[PDB]
Design an enzyme around this catalytic site. Sequence first.
Site, PDB file in Angstrom:
ATOM      1  N   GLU A   1       0.843  -1.185   0.000  1.00 60.88           N
ATOM      2  CA  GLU A   1       0.000   0.000   0.000  1.00 60.88           C
ATOM      3  C   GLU A   1       0.884   1.242   0.000  1.00 60.88           C
ATOM      4  OE1 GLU A   1      -2.302   1.168   3.670  1.00 60.88           O
ATOM      5  OE2 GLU A   1      -3.994   1.009   2.254  1.00 60.88           O
TER       6      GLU A   1
ATOM      7  N   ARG B   1      -4.528  -4.151   0.376  1.00 60.12           N
ATOM      8  CA  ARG B   1      -5.745  -3.371   0.163  1.00 60.12           C
ATOM      9  C   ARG B   1      -5.985  -3.112  -1.325  1.00 60.12           C
ATOM     10  NH1 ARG B   1      -4.933   0.260   5.080  1.00 60.12           N
ATOM     11  NH2 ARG B   1      -6.113  -0.811   6.714  1.00 60.12           N
TER      12      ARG B   1
ATOM     13  N   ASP C   1     -10.334   1.636  -0.441  1.00 57.45           N
ATOM     14  CA  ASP C   1     -10.120   3.079  -0.531  1.00 57.45           C
ATOM     15  C   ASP C   1     -11.450   3.845  -0.522  1.00 57.45           C
ATOM     16  OD1 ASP C   1      -7.273   3.017  -0.694  1.00 57.45           O
ATOM     17  OD2 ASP C   1      -7.299   2.990  -2.895  1.00 57.45           O
TER      18      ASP C   1
ATOM     19  N   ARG D   1       3.304  -0.063  17.188  1.00 53.55           N
ATOM     20  CA  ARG D   1       3.943   0.292  15.931  1.00 53.55           C
ATOM     21  C   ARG D   1       4.440   1.739  15.981  1.00 53.55           C
ATOM     22  NH1 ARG D   1       0.350  -0.835  10.808  1.00 53.55           N
ATOM     23  NH2 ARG D   1      -0.779   0.966  11.634  1.00 53.55           N
TER      24      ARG D   1
HETATM   25  O1  UDP Z   1       1.336 -11.343  14.386  1.00 60.63           O
HETATM   26  C1  UDP Z   1       1.581 -10.138  14.431  1.00 60.63           C
HETATM   27  C2  UDP Z   1       1.138  -9.153  13.490  1.00 60.63           C
HETATM   28  C3  UDP Z   1       1.486  -7.869  13.664  1.00 60.63           C
HETATM   29  N1  UDP Z   1       2.262  -7.447  14.717  1.00 60.63           N
HETATM   30  C4  UDP Z   1       2.627  -6.026  14.868  1.00 60.63           C
HETATM   31  O2  UDP Z   1       1.444  -5.257  14.866  1.00 60.63           O
HETATM   32  C5  UDP Z   1       1.663  -4.016  14.149  1.00 60.63           C
HETATM   33  C6  UDP Z   1       0.673  -3.909  13.015  1.00 60.63           C
HETATM   34  O3  UDP Z   1       1.011  -4.876  11.994  1.00 60.63           O
HETATM   35  P1  UDP Z   1       1.154  -4.431  10.461  1.00 60.63           P
HETATM   36  O4  UDP Z   1       2.066  -3.260  10.353  1.00 60.63           O
HETATM   37  O5  UDP Z   1       1.466  -5.646   9.652  1.00 60.63           O
HETATM   38  O6  UDP Z   1      -0.334  -3.931  10.164  1.00 60.63           O
HETATM   39  P2  UDP Z   1      -1.145  -3.400   8.878  1.00 60.63           P
HETATM   40  O7  UDP Z   1      -1.520  -1.985   9.205  1.00 60.63           O
HETATM   41  O8  UDP Z   1      -0.184  -3.521   7.735  1.00 60.63           O
HETATM   42  O9  UDP Z   1      -2.344  -4.315   8.763  1.00 60.63           O
HETATM   43  C7  UDP Z   1       3.145  -4.025  13.747  1.00 60.63           C
HETATM   44  O10 UDP Z   1       3.943  -3.354  14.710  1.00 60.63           O
HETATM   45  C8  UDP Z   1       3.486  -5.515  13.713  1.00 60.63           C
HETATM   46  O11 UDP Z   1       4.845  -5.785  13.984  1.00 60.63           O
HETATM   47  C9  UDP Z   1       2.731  -8.339  15.665  1.00 60.63           C
HETATM   48  O12 UDP Z   1       3.427  -8.009  16.615  1.00 60.63           O
HETATM   49  N2  UDP Z   1       2.351  -9.642  15.463  1.00 60.63           N
HETATM   50  C1  VVC Z   2      -0.633   5.735   7.840  1.00 58.41           C
HETATM   51  C2  VVC Z   2      -1.504   5.050   7.443  1.00 58.41           C
HETATM   52  C3  VVC Z   2      -2.560   4.202   6.859  1.00 58.41           C
HETATM   53  C4  VVC Z   2      -1.891   3.027   6.166  1.00 58.41           C
HETATM   54  O1  VVC Z   2      -2.855   2.148   5.608  1.00 58.41           O
HETATM   55  O2  VVC Z   2      -3.332   4.913   5.890  1.00 58.41           O
HETATM   56  C5  VVC Z   2      -4.701   4.942   6.257  1.00 58.41           C
HETATM   57  N1  VVC Z   2      -5.499   4.892   5.017  1.00 58.41           N
HETATM   58  C6  VVC Z   2      -5.196   3.988   4.045  1.00 58.41           C
HETATM   59  C7  VVC Z   2      -5.898   3.933   2.905  1.00 58.41           C
HETATM   60  C8  VVC Z   2      -6.968   4.851   2.744  1.00 58.41           C
HETATM   61  N2  VVC Z   2      -7.701   4.849   1.639  1.00 58.41           N
HETATM   62  N3  VVC Z   2      -7.263   5.752   3.691  1.00 58.41           N
HETATM   63  C9  VVC Z   2      -6.551   5.796   4.843  1.00 58.41           C
HETATM   64  O3  VVC Z   2      -6.813   6.604   5.741  1.00 58.41           O
HETATM   65  C10 VVC Z   2      -4.894   3.751   7.196  1.00 58.41           C
HETATM   66  C11 VVC Z   2      -3.564   3.756   7.940  1.00 58.41           C
HETATM   67  O4  VVC Z   2      -3.626   4.630   9.059  1.00 58.41           O
END
Ligand code: UDP
Ligand code: VVC
Lengths: 232, 232
Positions: free
Chosen positions: B35, B100, B105, B164
């Site tokens: 993304e 995504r 979106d 995170r």
């Molecule tokens: O099994 C898991 C999956 C995710 N995370 C943590 O949870 C946060 C969110 O994960 P990710 O960035 O993959 O989320 P997304 O926003 O991409 O779905 C990050 O700090 C990951 O390291 C974790 O500790 N264990």
């Molecule tokens: C930083 C960040 C992130 C990363 O996915 O972007 C936001 N997002 C993503 C796609 C979208 N169409 N609208 C959004 O608001 C959600 C998260 O907070």
Amino acid sequence: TRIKKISIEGNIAAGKSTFVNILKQLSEDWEVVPEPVARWSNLTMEQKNGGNVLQMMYEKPERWSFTFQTYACLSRIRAQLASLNGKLKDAEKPVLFFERSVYSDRYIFASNLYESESMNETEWTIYQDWHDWMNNQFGQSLELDGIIYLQATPETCLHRIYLRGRNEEQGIPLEYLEKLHYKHESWLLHRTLKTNFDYLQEVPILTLDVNEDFKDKYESLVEKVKEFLSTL
Amino acid sequence: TRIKKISIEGNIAAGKSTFVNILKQLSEDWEVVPEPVARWSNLTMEQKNGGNVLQMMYEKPERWSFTFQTYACLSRIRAQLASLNGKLKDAEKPVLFFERSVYSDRYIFASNLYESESMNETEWTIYQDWHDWMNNQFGQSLELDGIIYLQATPETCLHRIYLRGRNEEQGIPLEYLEKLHYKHESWLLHRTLKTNFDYLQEVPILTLDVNEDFKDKYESLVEKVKEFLSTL
Ligand SMILES: O=c1ccn([C@@H]2O[C@H](COP(=O)(O)OP(=O)(O)O)[C@@H](O)[C@H]2O)c(=O)[nH]1
Ligand SMILES: C#C[C@]1(CO)O[C@@H](n2ccc(N)nc2=O)C[C@@H]1O
Ligand SMILES: O=c1ccn([C@@H]2O[C@H](COP(=O)(O)OP(=O)(O)O)[C@@H](O)[C@H]2O)c(=O)[nH]1
Ligand SMILES: C#C[C@]1(CO)O[C@@H](n2ccc(N)nc2=O)C[C@@H]1O
């Protein structure tokens, strides 16, 4: 034969709509794509949105410039593609006249708003990024064979804004028209304005003086167009 | 072989990026389109613009939602099209995993922003018009074969958002994640959320619970993916 695409450019109330309405009647090989934004000014979804955003922009251009400009250009591209895929079917020397182009959207109007601080840097660069990619993906068959520049003075244009009487325009000062004039002259008369589209530097341009009223007396103007077309 | 296109969907910090990064390593036939917005969080012009607008939107969503959402979607479309022209064509059973989609979106994020009054009616309608048009130009090219929905609770997500530690996300309240949750559930689980894209009614969906950490224990998740892929 492939359709020739010719853009009609010029300042606000220069008389592009008058001229293009005169042309379309003179030949069955000649067609016209009006500027969507002008139709907005005047039921449909685009016109309703265009109505609102046009009014919102002239009320507060620093909030709405980006939104307005992206929608005006999107609308243009769509209308212009709809006319190409269609029209001038069996014609021998088909010519399609665009009331303004995607280039004047970016390099006249959007540019101006940025330089007048109605778009910040992020908005401008996002817009340009959008414009670039929006072009190559959807607008390669829109490339211009020529440009017709209707040159009027800002003073004539402000007078002609008055005559027409669109509400959202009666606030426009001569200085705003002058800035738009400067960019038209740069791009079309002097050809100083650099674009992101390499082909535009080798594109032929016809400049017509339209300061004198031409509604009842346009034959000289149309003869120049015909000479110009014959060189394309 | 035509490339199979699978979307990974899920709330903020459900673990899409983690999972996508596990998947890509397991098969030379498996590729991944991250993304763009995530990469804005972290040099390029998109990243700079993305950094600013991302920060602007979380600072003031009622001003910047529209601008943000259009540029996120633009950026995704561009990256997804670009990944579609790699060497994954000549692989045996090629799968491209989108982090995504253009659907989320619009029908999760942009939708929710309009419903939370961060976009007004004109902004929302313009966005939809722009999104309708620009998708339907790229007929069938980005159309998904399947969806993988990583389901985690809003509470799990808020916790993972903190761990995170992205600046622009530290303002996010639980209620915001609950709205997004609701819209994921409607779209992907209950399948009540109807869209403008009719083929999405029939697209198969795999739901995976990812509340439990899976970073070092993901075999069961991946096995479900492979089984799922074989039915496509
Ligand atoms: O099994 C898991 C999956 C995710 N995370 C943590 O949870 C946060 C969110 O994960 P990710 O960035 O993959 O989320 P997304 O926003 O991409 O779905 C990050 O700090 C990951 O390291 C974790 O500790 N264990
Ligand atoms: C930083 C960040 C992130 C990363 O996915 O972007 C936001 N997002 C993503 C796609 C979208 N169409 N609208 C959004 O608001 C959600 C998260 O907070
Ligand atoms: O020779 C001319 C050209 C224009 N106009 C008027 O000036 C206004 C602006 O013309 P138009 O709408 O064509 O301008 P555009 O904005 O399209 O350049 C309108 O009231 C026209 O009727 C006019 O009276 N005589
Ligand atoms: C009403 C009106 C008009 C009709 O051409 O729209 C303005 N316009 C047009 C194109 C563009 N890209 N930006 C603009 O501001 C100029 C006029 O005032």
